[PDB]
Design a protein around this ligand. Sequence first.
Ligand SMILES: [Cl-]
Ligand SMILES: [Cl-]
Ligand SMILES: [Zn+2]
Ligand SMILES: [Zn+2]
Ligand SMILES: [Zn+2]
Length: 246
Amino acid sequence: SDHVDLPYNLTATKIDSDVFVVTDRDFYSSNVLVAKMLDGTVVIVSSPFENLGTQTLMDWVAKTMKPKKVVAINTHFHLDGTGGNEIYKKMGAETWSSDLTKQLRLEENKKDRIKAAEFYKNEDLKRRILSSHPVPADNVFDLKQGKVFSFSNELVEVSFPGPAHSPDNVVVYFPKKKLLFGGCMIKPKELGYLGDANVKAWPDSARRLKKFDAKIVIPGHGEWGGPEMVNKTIKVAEKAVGEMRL
Ligand SMILES: [Cl-]
Ligand SMILES: [Cl-]
Ligand SMILES: [Zn+2]
Ligand SMILES: [Zn+2]
Ligand SMILES: [Zn+2]
């Protein structure tokens, strides 16, 4: 069997030695990367949307990886990105995002909760959303400068290719495994939710991802693939630019 099932319909799939994709199937099949470094540090990129999914993920991480330390990197300000911060903190993980991601999270938190919960089209999901209280990351770097983590010389590179799915979207590259977590700016079929998107800039932003020697590219939603994920995304963004007359 090619996956393991967790509570709240999370799925964990192994894509490499020490690398898993955990997918929150209740909330739009949101992908979270979990990569164990050689020195025992567990790096988590993105998050499930809310507290029950995040707690389920961390339970599974503690059990299966026995991390010496966990570092969680928010990819953008949406809930698939910041929705895990509350539980990441409570479970002793070190949470990181860009400054802009933190600011947009704080701004989003001012919006009327009830109205914002209407996006969700099943009552249990709405309830879980309202039951959580998303917070920004505790640690912050400058968006345009990005940040390189070093775990005993194993590098994790976070960088900002430009606005696309959102103004703050960052990618996470692991040069050792040639792994790019492109997040929600990887859209090989259709762009999806446009509420924070910059469609006109998206082709150029995705194009900057081509410099990464990626064996595997992981999107925010749906199945992962190779370097071609980026090229498809550019084609998709460019088609949208055309249809919207931008
Ligand atoms: Cl929110
Ligand atoms: Cl998305
Ligand atoms: Zn199953
Ligand atoms: Zn998003
Ligand atoms: Zn997303």
